[PDB]
């Protein structure tokens, strides 16, 4: 009863080549599953993380290249526009020829970069105010500095949009970096050197005098500034409670409760906010309702900003934009980022231009690219099979509610309510293939010149931000997908109560209609349960069946959730990560992902058990002395065969809310009685601790 099909031969070969059978499954299942891969592969110079999963992403880019790189006569305008955008991006000769000129022409439009001008105070300081400058960068270019104001969905009323105020992102990957010692020293040094190098190129290009000492002096004050901001931001661990984060005020309240004085204004929230929203002919009453995500940070800001010049503030503000633009200019400008990206990512070269460009067009025209992708690469009836798997796993979640001892009856009911109400999205929106008019009209207001990449990217920034802003007074569109099709990932949205499985992730090793069921459940099955369980993790349990932030938990059941989940905070917090210098994972920041992983694994396996019940056992795979329960776990694990550059491990231990792949594997299986049954693991073997965490 060995399966001998070509599809079985492909699966088996892949499983064999990745694994190391010389390792005991019960000693370290990651090494058992993945030790073959580890030994054979070295992380590319252009990769910060590399592994089976990242390889799928690499392989998707190859498809994008194929479908973008050749004009076809029947191409509708939406597709012509994406191909032209592609072409403008890969023409390095045209870009190199422009030097930094396309940046220099921009600079006057954001109130300048003082470091890199003469007499900035005379030109710009006159008319400068922080209201105007912050708003310009925000509203025109989508760049949010000092104070992060955005239109988004209303957590407590999911059909509506509202203005939000939050702390800004930083130039370094997390607030931690701004310690600037030890493992962060090189990044902080590279960051300031990067500032300086760019200011120098700009001055050289402007034929201005260059005084290195004054360069160093101005850019160090930028760092000192952003240090204070960083230190003023709230930690992720203090931002993990959506009920606590949601503070709805009026602009009046805001003016009265969070005053700032910049360059001696002081600061008018009404004016700042209108100077943004005026940009889509929208008018803001000092009686406008606003969601304020970071009250404490605004409070802390007041003392900081009062100490700095307009010139100081704009040196940071404009750097934070210029930062992003340099890799879209000529080689000298591209070059200047080298040490910085090495410090953050460990990479010694940039990815191939065509790959960066394929990704850029994908990111900005996700529907046009998704259409070409699914036409090239996506079966068509994958969709129907996946729809049915999702039905199954949803049922298994529902059914499991009854075995869970730590909730009461009523809370279970509402949990089931929320399960039945999750709306699933599989592969791609049929629209993007079937409705040419709609797709064209999405990009109507865009027109790309093939010789002007920089103008094209700027146009995109302006477009996407004008687009987001105008949404204020409009309802949330219930049709809209939260991902393009051409993406190797999946998603849950709490505002929308929606799970999304783009075509991009519906392929081996996760899924094929042609691969064994054990593989499908331990792969895409696990991913489905993961996304579902997000509706019920420490964030998405606070949102109800309709995506509104409202407490549907009893006191006891909510306290019990915390208790059950605390086990995982401790388990994963106790993992130390060699590649990140021996640091422990953050068990709080990874909690939600770890809950989804552990829940999803249990759900998928149950669903497979049920499959076997109903359908009988599957023919075995050749070359593998494993049964299908064992294969389920093998395939599960091999999703995460991979490794990290040390520099990136230091980054993602802070910035990634997922555990690193090896610990996703060890974590979840440590917690699975089923795993330990399958591989006959001794009690208190490493893979089989007596104490096991469970939430869903
Ligand atoms: C790769 C990672 N994405 C994920 O982990 C899941 C999708 C997912 C979930 C579980 C697995 C998994 C597979 C095998 C074994 C363990 C976990 C793989 C992908 C998507 P998600 O976390 O909902 C993200 C927020 N969109 C990321 O965005 O960086
Ligand atoms: C790159 O753009 C320049 C603009 O002058 C053009 O001359 C050249 O033909 C383009 N290269 C290609 C191969 O598209
Ligand atoms: C905002 O206030 C500034 C202060 O000079 C003023 O010049 C400008 O007209 C105001 N803008 C709006 C949108 O009210
Ligand atoms: C490690 O686990 C122990 C046992 O629960 C716990 O007391 C400790 O706080 C954990 N350490 C971390 C950093 O999670
Ligand atoms: Zn997740």
Swiss-Prot record:
Using the chain's own numbering, where are the disulfide bonds? Answer: 3-8, 26-681, 34-641, 89-357, 180-188, 567-693
The record's InterPro entries line, in alphabetical order, gives: MetalloPept_cat_dom_sf, Peptidase_M13, Peptidase_M13_C, Peptidase_M13_dom_2, Peptidase_M13_N
Effect of altering residue 567 to R?
In CMT2T; decrease of protein expression
**Gene3D superfamilies for the chain:** Collagenase (Catalytic Domain), Neutral endopeptidase , domain2
Known regulation of activity: Inhibited in a dose dependent manner by opiorphin. Activated by K49-P1-20, a twenty-residue synthetic peptide shortened from the snake B.asper myotoxin II.
Pinpoint the Peptidase M13 domain residues: 2-696
Coarse class of the primary localization is membrane
| Alphabetical UniProt keywords | Cell membrane, Charcot-Marie-Tooth disease, Disease variant, Disulfide bond, Glycoprotein, Hydrolase, Lipoprotein, Membrane, Metal-binding, Metalloprotease, Myristate, Neurodegeneration, Neuropathy, Phosphoprotein, Protease, Signal-anchor, Spinocerebellar ataxia, Transmembrane, Transmembrane helix, Zinc
Enzyme class, top EC level, equals hydrolase
Q: How is it modified after translation?
A: Myristoylation is a determinant of membrane targeting.
List the catalysed reactions: Preferential cleavage of polypeptides between hydrophobic residues, particularly with Phe or Tyr at P1'; substance P + H2O = substance P(1-9) + L-Leu-L-Met-NH2; substance P + H2O = substance P(1-7) + L-Phe-Gly-L-Leu-L-Met-NH2; neurotensin + H2O = neurotensin(1-11) + L-isoleucyl-L-leucine
- At the top level of its lineage, which domain of life is listed? Eukaryota
Active-site positions, per UniProt? 531, 597
Q: Carries keyword Lipoprotein?
A: yes
Q: Report the GO molecular function annotations.
A: cardiolipin binding; endopeptidase activity; exopeptidase activity; metallocarboxypeptidase activity; metalloendopeptidase activity; oligopeptidase activity; peptide binding; phosphatidylserine binding
User: PANTHER family from the xrefs?
Assistant: NEPRILYSIN, ZINC METALLOPROTEASE FAMILY M13 NEPRILYSIN-RELATED
Q: What does this protein do?
A: Thermolysin-like specificity, but is almost confined on acting on polypeptides of up to 30 amino acids. Biologically important in the destruction of opioid peptides such as Met- and Leu-enkephalins by cleavage of a Gly-Phe bond. Catalyzes cleavage of bradykinin, substance P and neurotensin peptides. Able to cleave angiotensin-1, angiotensin-2 and angiotensin 1-9. Involved in the degradation of atrial natriuretic factor (ANF) and brain natriuretic factor (BNP(1-32)). Displays UV-inducible elastase activity toward skin preelastic and elastic fibers.
The protein's name: Neprilysin
Q: What is the originating organism of this protein?
A: Homo sapiens
């Amino acid at each position: 009863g060995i399966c001998k099909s070509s599809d079985c031969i492909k699966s088996a070969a892949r499983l064999i080549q990745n694994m190391d059978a010389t390792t005991e499954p019960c000693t370290d299942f990651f090494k058992y599953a993945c030790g073959g891969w580890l030994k054979r592969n070295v992380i590319p110079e252009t990769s910060s993380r590399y592994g089976n999963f990242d390889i799928l992403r690499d392989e998707l880019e190859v498809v994008l290249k194929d479908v973008l790189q050749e004009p076809k006569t029947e191409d509708i305008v939406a597709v012509q526009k994406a191909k032209a955008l592609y072409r403008s991006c890969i023409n390095e000769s045209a870009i190199d020829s422009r030097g930094g000129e396309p940046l220099l022409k921009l600079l006057p439009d954001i109130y300048g970069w003082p470091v890199a001008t003469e007499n900035w105070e005379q030109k710009y300081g006159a008319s400068w105010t922080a209201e105007k400058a912050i708003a310009q960068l925000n509203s025109k270019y989508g760049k949010k500095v000092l104070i992060n104001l955005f239109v988004g969905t209303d957590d407590k009323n999911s059909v509506n949009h509202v203005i939000h105020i939050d702390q800004p992102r930083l130039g370094l990957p997390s607030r931690d970096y701004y310690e600037c010692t030890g493992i962060y020293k090189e990044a902080c040094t590279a960051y300031v050197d990067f500032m300086i190098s760019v200011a120098r190129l700009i001055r050289q290009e402007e034929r201005l005098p260059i005084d290195e000492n004054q360069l160093a002096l101005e850019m160090n004050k930028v760092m000192e500034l952003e240090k204070e901001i960083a230190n003023a931001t709230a930690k992720p661990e203090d931002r993990n409670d959506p009920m606590l984060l949601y503070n709805k005020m009026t602009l009046a309240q805001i003016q009265n409760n969070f005053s700032l004085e910049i360059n001696g204004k002081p600061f008018s929230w009404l004016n700042f906010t209108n100077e943004i929203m005026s940009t889509v002919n929208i008018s803001i009453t000092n009686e406008e309702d606003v969601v304020v995500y970071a009250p404490e940070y605004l409070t802390k800001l007041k003392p900081i900003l009062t100490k700095y010049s307009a010139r100081d503030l704009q040196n940071l503000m404009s750097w934070r934009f210029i930062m992003d633009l340099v890799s879209s200019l000529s080689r000298t400008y591209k070059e200047s980022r080298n040490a910085f990206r090495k410090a953050l990512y460990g990479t010694t070269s940039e990815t191939a231009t065509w790959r960066r460009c394929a990704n850029y067009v994908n990111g900005n025209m996700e529907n046009a690219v998704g259409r070409l992708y699914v036409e090239a690469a996506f079966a068509g009836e994958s969709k129907h099979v996946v729809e049915d798997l999702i039905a199954q796993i949803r049922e298994v979640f529902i059914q499991t509610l009854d075995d869970l001892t730590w909730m009461d009856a009523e809370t279970k009911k509402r949990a089931e309510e929320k399960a039945l109400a999750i709306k699933e999205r599989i592969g791609y929106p049929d629209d993007i293939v079937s409705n040419d008019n709609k797709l064209n009209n999405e990009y109507l207001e865009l027109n790309y010149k093939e010789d002007e990449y920089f103008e094209n990217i700027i146009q995109n920034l302006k477009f996407s931000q004008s687009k987001q802003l105008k949404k204020l007074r409009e309802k949330v569109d219930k049709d809209e997908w939260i991902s393009g099709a051409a993406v190797v990932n999946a998603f849950y949205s709490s505002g929308r109560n929606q799970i999304v499985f783009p075509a991009g992730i519906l392929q081996p090793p996760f899924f094929s209609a042609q691969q064994s069921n054990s593989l499908n459940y331990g792969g895409i099955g696990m991913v489905i349960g993961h996304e579902i369980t997000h509706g019920f993790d420490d964030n998405g349990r606070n949102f109800n069946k309709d995506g509104d932030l409202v407490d549907w938990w009893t006191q006891q059941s909510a306290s019990n959730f915390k208790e059950q989940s605390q086990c995982m905070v401790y388990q994963y917090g106790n993992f130390s990560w060699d590649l990140a210098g021996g640091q422990h994972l953050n068990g709080i920041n990874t909690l939600g992902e770890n809950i989804a992983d552990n829940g999803g694994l249990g759900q998928a396996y149950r669903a497979y058990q049920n499959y076997i019940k109903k359908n009988g056992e599957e023919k075995l795979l050749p070359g593998l002395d494993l049964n299908h329960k064992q294969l389920f776990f093998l395939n599960f694990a091999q999703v995460w065969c991979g490794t990290y550059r040390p520099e990136y491990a230091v980054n993602s231990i802070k910035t990634d809310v997922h555990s690193p792949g090896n610990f996703r594997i060890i974590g979840t299986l440590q917690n699975s009685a089923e795993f330990s049954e399958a591989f006959h693991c001794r009690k208190n073997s490493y893979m089989n601790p007596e104490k096991k965490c469970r939430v869903w």
